[PDB]
């Protein structure tokens, strides 16, 4: 069905809307922008003489783009396909390769939405999300990004995150803030997220390997996947999705990567909320692989020996965890989660490591608060 | 009867389009060095000037079965509707195919189509589809059907770009519609006879003597004068002369007592034509007509012609043989005889003369084909130089 709905699509060429049409066509990215600035404009949008009311055209256009661009990535052949090397399932993706071009996906994603804001009388104005740009519309050019041009280098891979993926998960971490989470923005740009983004990051996961020019990067990747996990509004699937997305990253980061979220780590733990489960359980697994890393004087030669803040930090932990479980009242889940912690703490922290009495003093609130995260 | 088209047969891709509300004629060509990219010189104004076929031509090796091509690429014939065929260039020898290089004006979707060396590849084989709502899959295919043409890499069709100022031809899934026009037929041609198409030189009544222009002064005026020489001129590419002729389609045919036919030499590109002052003088491409470039091969010298005939469509009898037989050059408007001045490297001046001289008979020999392509690449070589030299100087 996808063969033969391409090759119809692709024959009589004028479904694809003016755009990609092929006749001056000012491109899809531009075709976004230009829908955008439409739906801006009100004599534009409407008839002038909601859906019933007035059916939005700016949203019409990019709602049709998305899903021929939806539809397209999934007559996308599927990769195992490619991998056995079908002649007509290359042709199908060279083909769709060519119709779609790579730098108009990446500029479609890296367009912004519009933001909820608190208001003077302190109500939230929302904007109508049925006339404006939508997280779902980035959905589908990540679903073709994935199944069509796909992600297998790790230049490309940090070149998109920071471009759009970034900016999408600090605005779902600005979001999370308690007045603006019932609102529509964050329920959609939440599922947009977990459905689309994260999973594919969690797929890519290996080709974080190489990233040692790129930390800073990567340290806020960790920082607002971090805080959209604290977040409340989240559904168990989306949760589930995000520790899969996390505990996948870190696993393959590399462990002078992951500090700054150690330090947010060793904060957050010991108040054993039912939110630190995930925490715990990453910790287990951060400190089970990196063990010859830090107990080991020499340490893993390509990736170094601690720095010993990070070992005073690990010993902070382990001293604040036993304690909080200590007085904290039993129960299974928790318990059991908790032992593999402390025990892999235990393990990682080298036993005749000397507690410097002149550890760097006053640690900072300021990037580090639970009343607004800063 | 209607002729089936046949493997190893030399065909030109003809096509109209429409401009000014007028229907232009034109055929499929491309040059073999420096231009792979393909493009379409005119043949509507056959009279006013010459159409160039020889790249226009065309040579169908094979005719296989599409899914024949598919596990082929895994791994004389009669031409069907819906089977892939490969073109093989008459004059480069490579192969027409889908370049998937595009310069992408107006249409960033479309490829661009030109020559490749490699056989190998899905680009070089073209899948026949018919045109005509009445033909069908996997029936005859017609000696002069409509036809359309889909590249096997991309399914684009061989497509004419309108939109662009000069009329483009590229690879698009807009359809184009194309005319097979036999040039000739290869397995009917008959061995020493001359056949439209082909490079010969005019040895002259001495046996030995061929007629030439003057040896390069890098003066075109001297040039363009016309004499007879012997000696080694004739070996060299000077001597060379192309007999193309009036028809645009069966060009490649034999070619007969009386029929007319026009003149051109190869390295430097001018057709043989009549002056007002009796003289020869080659011209260029665009201001040689037909009336100005025009001969006919006439056996007996005398006055009364052979008569009007019809040009019949096929190969025709073996009626001129190479070396035996003896040919007598006479101008078709003026009736004037192709004779020597007779008077003062010989540097003989050839005259057109009305009664001519006895001494007028005419042999011709055969070029090889590496004479011909090579004499073919000197003058594309120094056209291009020259170009460059001018600019260079600019």
Same mark, same amino acid.
Request: net charge negative; proline share 3%.
């Given at each position: ?374 | ?225 016309? $004499?007879? !020489? =012997? ?7 000077? /001597?060379?002369?192309?007999? @193309?002729?009036? #028809?645009? +389609? ?102 057109? $003369?009305? !009664? =001519? ?7 011709? /020999?055969?070029?090889?084909? @590496?004479?011909? #392509?090579? +004499? ?19």
């Amino acid at each position: 069905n996808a063969n033969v709905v391409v090759r119809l699509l692709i024959r009589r060429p004028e479904c694809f809307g003016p755009a990609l049409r092929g006749e001056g066509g000012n491109g899809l990215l531009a075709a976004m922008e230009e829908a955008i600035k439409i739906a801006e404009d009100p004599s534009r949008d409407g008839p002038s003489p909601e859906e019933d009311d007035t059916i939005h055209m700016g949203n019409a256009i990019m709602t049709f783009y998305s899903a021929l661009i939806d539809l397209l990535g999934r007559c996308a052949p599927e990769m195992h396909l490619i991998h056995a090397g079908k002649g007509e399932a290359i042709r199908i993706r060279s083909i769709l390769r060519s119709l779609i071009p790579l730098g108009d996906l990446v500029g479609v994603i890296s367009i912004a939405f519009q933001m909820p804001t608190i208001a003077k009388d302190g109500n939230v104005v929302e904007p109508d999300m049925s006339a404006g740009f939508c997280p779902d519309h980035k959905a589908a050019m990540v679903l073709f990004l994935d199944r069509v041009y796909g992600i297998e280098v790790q230049d490309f891979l940090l070149h998109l995150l920071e471009v759009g993926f970034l900016p999408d998960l600090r605005a779902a971490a600005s979001l999370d803030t308690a007045a603006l989470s019932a609102t529509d923005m964050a329920l959609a740009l939440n599922r947009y997220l977990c459905t689309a983004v994260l999973p594919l990051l969690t797929r890519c996961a290996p080709l974080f390997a190489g990233t040692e020019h790129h930390a800073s990067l990567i340290d806020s990747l960790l920082h607002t996947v971090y805080r959209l996990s604290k977040g409340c509004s989240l559904t168990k699937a989306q949760r589930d999705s995000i520790e899969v997305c996390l505990l996948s990253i870190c696993g393959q980061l590399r462990p002078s990567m992951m500090q700054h979220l150690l330090r947010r780590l060793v904060f957050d733990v010991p108040l054993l909320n039912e939110h630190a489960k995930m925490p715990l359980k990453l910790l287990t697994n951060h400190y089970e692989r990196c063990w010859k890393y830090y107990c080991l004087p020499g340490g893993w030669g390509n990736f170094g020996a601690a720095s010993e803040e990070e070992l005073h930090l690990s010993r902070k932990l382990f001293w604040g965890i036993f304690d909080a479980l200590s007085q904290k009242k039993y129960e299974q889940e928790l318990f059991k989660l908790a032992l593999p912690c402390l025990s892999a703490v235990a393990g990682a922290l080298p036993p005749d490591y000397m507690e410097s009495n002149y550890v760097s003093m006053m640690e900072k609130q300021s990037s580090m608060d639970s009343e607004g995260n800063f | 009867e209607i002729q089936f088209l046949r493997t190893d047969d030399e065909v030109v891709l003809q096509c109209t389009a429409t401009i000014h509300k007028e229907q232009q004629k034109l055929c499929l060509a491309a040059e073999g060095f420096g231009n792979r990219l393909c493009f379409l010189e005119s043949t509507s104004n056959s009279k006013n000037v010459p159409p160039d076929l020889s790249i226009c031509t065309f040579v169908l090796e094979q005719s296989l079965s599409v899914r024949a091509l598919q596990e082929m690429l895994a791994n004389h014939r009669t031409l069907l509707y819906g089977h892939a065929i490969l073109l093989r260039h008459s004059y480069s020898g490579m192969y027409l195919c889908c370049l998937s290089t595009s310069r992408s004006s107006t249409d960033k979707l479309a490829f661009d189509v030109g020559l490749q060396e490699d056989t190998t590849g899905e680009a070089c084989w073209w899948t026949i589809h018919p045109a005509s709502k009445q033909r069908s899959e996997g029936e005859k295919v017609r000696v002069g059907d409509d036809l359309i043409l889909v590249s096997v890499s991309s399914e684009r069709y061989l497509h004419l770009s309108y939109g662009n100022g000069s009329l483009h031809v590229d690879a698009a899934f807009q359809q184009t519609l194309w005319s097979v026009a036999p040039i000739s037929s290869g397995s009917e041609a008959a061995q020493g006879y001359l056949i439209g198409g082909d490079v010969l030189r005019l040895l002259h009544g001495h046996m030995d003597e061929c007629l030439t222009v003057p040896s390069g002064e890098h003066g075109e005026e001297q040039r363009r004068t016309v $004499h007879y !020489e =012997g000696g080694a001129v004739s070996v060299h590419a000077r /001597s060379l002369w192309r007999l @193309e002729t009036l #028809r645009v +389609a069966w060009s490649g045919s034999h070619i007969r007592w009386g029929q007319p036919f026009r003149l051109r030499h190869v390295t430097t590109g001018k057709y043989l034509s009549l002056m007002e002052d009796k003289n020869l003088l080659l011209m260029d491409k665009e201001k040689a007509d037909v009336k100005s470039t025009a001969f006919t091969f006439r056996s007996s010298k005398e006055k009364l012609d052979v008569g009007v005939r019809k040009e019949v469509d096929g190969m025709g009898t073996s009626e001129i043989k190479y070396g035996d037989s003896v040919c007598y050059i006479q101008h078709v408007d003026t009736g004037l005889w192709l004779t020597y001045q007779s008077v003062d490297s010989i540097q003989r001046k050839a005259i057109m $003369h009305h !009664e =001519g001289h006895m001494d007028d008979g005419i042999s011709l /020999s055969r070029s090889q084909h @590496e004479e011909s #392509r090579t +004499a073919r690449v000197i003058r594309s070589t120094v056209f291009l130089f020259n170009r460059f030299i001018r600019g260079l100087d600019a």
